[PDB]
Every structure is written in C-alpha cells, then in structure tokens.
Amino acid sequence: EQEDVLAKELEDVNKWGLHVFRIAELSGNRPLTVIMHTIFQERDLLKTFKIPVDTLITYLMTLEDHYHADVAYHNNIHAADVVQSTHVLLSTPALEAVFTDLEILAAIFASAIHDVDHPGVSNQFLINTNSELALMYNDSSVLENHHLAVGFKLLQEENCDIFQNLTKKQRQSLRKMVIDIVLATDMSKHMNLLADLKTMVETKKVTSSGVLLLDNYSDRIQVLQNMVHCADLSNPTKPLQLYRQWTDRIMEEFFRQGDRERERGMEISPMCDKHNASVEKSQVGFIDYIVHPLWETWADLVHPDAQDILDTLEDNREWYQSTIP
C-alpha cells in the first residue's frame, strides 16, 4: 500500500536526511501536512496544547494550499523540509530541557509558515518592479512580513484556530516569538544575525548538566532565530542526492526570475541568468560565504552535536568544487 510506504518513510522524521521528496509524492503532495502532523504527535503537542486533531489537519491543509504548487523551490516541500530540519535541531543534546513547550511550538509553527504564499521572486525583484507587496510593506522584509500575515490570517478560517485552547498570555507570547523568528529568515538580516550568534558562542554559558544556559528573552529568541535560519539554509548540509534536487529547484526558480528581469530590461540578478550561469561555482560560493560560516558557528554553539552535519556540508562543498575544473 502507498500508505504503508508513507508510514515507513515517516518513521525517519527524527533523522537528518529524511526522504522528503518521496514523502511529498507518497502523501499526494501533502508533505507539510503529514510531516507537521507526525512531528506534533511525536512531541505530544496536541495533548499539551489541547489542539483538536481535525483543527490541526484543517489548518495544515489550508496552510499547505497557500504555498504555490507552481514555484520550483519556495513551495510546500521546502516548508516541510524546514519544519523537519528545525524539529531535528530542537532535539540536539546541547538544548535538552532548554526550551519550553510554547517555544518549541513557536519554532515549529514559524518554520511551517515561514515562506507561505511565496511568489518565487526575491524581495529585491518585488521592490524594483514596484510590486503591490513592496508598496504594502515599505520595501522592508517584504516577503517575510507577508508570510507571517498569511500564516496568522489562515488561523481565522473555519476550524483552523490550532491555538484556540492556549491562554491569552500564551497566544501573545507565541505570536511575538513567531514574528521574531520569521523576520530573521530575511537574508538581509543574515550578517547581523551571524555576528550576534558568534558573540554568543564566544561568551556561551553551560549549565551543570552541560546544556546551554539561556536566561533572558533576547538570548532564547536569538537561538531560535538562528536555528530556523540554519534549517532554512540547510540544503547543502543534507545527503548529496537531496542537496542536488534542491539546487536544481532553486536554479529553476532563479532562472525564471532572471527571464522576467531580462524581458523588462533590468539588470539580471546574481545567479539568475540561464545564459551566463555557473551553477557549481554558485554553490561553492554560497557555501563558502553564507552556509558554512553559519553552520560552523551553530556547530560551535552545540559542539559536538552537529559535527556529522558539518562534515556532510564540507563533503558536499568538495564535491561541487570537484565538478568545476
């Protein structure tokens, strides 16, 4: 049965390298719904937060429908992958018993919504084309503000309020944390976020049990922001057969954007010109300047928990580099 194979694959939800594309096919293009449901059951979140199962499924299906099935990368498979990757990172030994159930819920929910309704073009493209989204959001974290607004507005649809049984203080705290986490996925914030994560590593405090000591909102939210940003930038850290599929998809999405820019007489964005592209050099640069600086720092924060992930990233960088000469 197709459902038996799906269930088998979902037994890997605690593992880096889950067969997320296979789950997308086996679930009938519902990877985000089935992975979120499995994660909520694995973490006992429905019981903890009194979430009716039918409300959870109804919301997840509606949220998943608001990802664009015609966008090659920023679709429901990406959202499911970022959810599952955040779920693995939350389980790292260095964070055991660090975060509350509400903080865990915020990080997972933020991951699920963090790209919803993405049109497959960048913030800079939306700004430069005078788009309605950029007009609404004053050119500032245009997509990320939109993803938050859609993700929260869908909670108001019929039988979609998965937070119906949280206290008012819980809903207020969860909303603020989710906003802070999704806004941190704007790449224009990456350098300052990484700089701050490095300062935390250099000053980090560990408890008598060996777990990170985070004793104020600023430190707790910074870790959760960088956790979801690492999940969002995790593709080059995955087994190569998954990483190559993510690269094929982001290139397709970029090339389609660059076709729009070329037609409009605009300068083509970096990496978006299918007639002057070096996919492999672009991956090596992405890893060297963005992905490895981030993941090496996260690995230092939770050291040695993420050593195998870092090792895979480094192997994948070597593999892409080897395809150049």
Add this chain to the structure above:
Amino acid sequence: EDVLAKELEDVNKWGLHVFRIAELSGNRPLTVIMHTIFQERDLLKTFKIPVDTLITYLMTLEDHYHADVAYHNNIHAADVVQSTHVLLSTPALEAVFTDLEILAAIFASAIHDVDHPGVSNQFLINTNSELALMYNDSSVLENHHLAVGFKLLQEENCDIFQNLTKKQRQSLRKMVIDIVLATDMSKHMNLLADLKTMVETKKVTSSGVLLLDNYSDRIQVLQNMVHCADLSNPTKPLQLYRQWTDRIMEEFFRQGDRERERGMEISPMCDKHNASVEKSQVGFIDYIVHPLWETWADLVHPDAQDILDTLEDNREWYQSTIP
C-alpha cells in the same frame, strides 16, 4: 480668499494660524499649505512637478485624512508640514540638506498620519485588527500611512514624482520611509539618544553651522526634525496649543469609550471619567517634549531659542492651572 492669502503670508513663521487657514480654505489646509510651501521653495520648477498634478495629489491625500478624527486629521498634517518647513530653514542647518532631502522631509510630513483611524497602535494590536495582522504588530499605523501615501501617487494625474529619475525616486522613497517610521512614539527614546550623541560630537563652522558628512547622521536629523514637528503643539502660541490639547483629548476619550464598551482596560489619558488634562500636559512636556526640544535647540543653537521659550512659558501656564 483674500484673507486666506493674508494668513498664508505667515507660512515661514512658527505659529501660523492653521485653524483659520483650515476654515478659510474650505477644510483644505493640507492642500493650500503644501502648495504654498512648494511654490515658496521653488520645488515645482526644481522637480518639474506639473501644478495640476500636485494639486490633484494633494486633494486626494487630504481626502484620505478622516474628517471625523479630532486630532489625527488633515489640519494636523498641514501643521506638521508647515512646522517641518520652518525647521528646515533653521540658520544652523544651512547647507546641510539637498533639495531631494528637503522634498523628502516635506512629503513625509504631509503623508505621515494619512488614513489614521484615531486609535493607537496598542489599541489596534489588542483588538486583533486587520492592520496589526498585516503589519505584524510593528509600527502598524506608520507602515499604513506610508503605504497609503505612496499608493495614492498611482491615481490618475497624481504622480508628482513623474519627472524624477528612477534613482531620485528610489532615494526619496527610502528617506520618506525612514522618516515616517521614526514618528512611531515607540522609537522616541532611541531617536532622542541618537540626537544627543550627535549634539555631543557636533561639528560646526565658525559661523555655528552644522556639518553633517554622512547619510546616517543626516537622516537621523531629518527623523528628529519631523518628530519634533509632530511633537510641536506645546511649543506653539498658547491659543493654538490649547486647541490641539482639546483635540487630542477628544480623540483619546473616544478611544477610551471604545475600550470601555469592549470591556478593555482604558489606555492612559483616555478615561474621560478619570482624566487630568492639565497634569497630563505638564507630564508630557516634562518627560517627552522638553527633553526632545532642549536637545534640538542644542543642535541648532541658538536658533530654536524662541520655540523653546514658548514651550517653557506654556508649561508654566498649564502648571498654574493645577490647584
């Protein structure tokens, strides 16, 4: 219309009779004052703005201020525009700001509260309003004022920036966004701290004229300038100030009536059954308005002395009405 022209001769003076202008212009103070200031600064010729486009945009903008909101309406907008216009001419700021920067501060002032509903950001957040959902609880009103002010340029014959280059338009847009977002009072303390740092390190010519080399410093001055203009009511002649106080208290009390009817906790200064209007003005001057204007006066010393003098006289008067 001849009396209206006589009043507009004071457009370069602190204490313009803005309420008289509102009445004499048929409730078009924002349009007539903006047009006057644009003519006075030669901005139409400088930026090739067709006069019909300017007037059409101004009237559309002014129509999107609510006539039933007692304070945050077109008269307040016109007042902030004209106040910014005066502050831009401070002698100590001579040679600081380009024409594009001047255009940006004046346009920002004109749009800075457009479509204001007469309730605060906190109210909009606590009522789970559509605006707060759109803007993720962050500078909710101010993001909305910007979005409306810019969207209206797309109406028929409304694009007053049509003859700017794409680069000029992009620079103006960024400066206007940075200025209007700085009018959110949640940013007041950080803005004031940065203005103080700028005072402590200020460089001037031998004539006492401010030298601001970097864009970060210049936009901070323009942010503080429009913020001072937005907070200028207690620095105006007392007859004007008392009308502004009556208006903000009416708007606050109406917010409090909505909060009471909803069963919400009533916001500070918003409970008409437990208010002390005069004590609130003295506290607002002592903790917000005078620290800000004293710092501005230091930046432009001694050019703001008469404004600061009025504020101090008005504080003493309001204090004297407390038994």
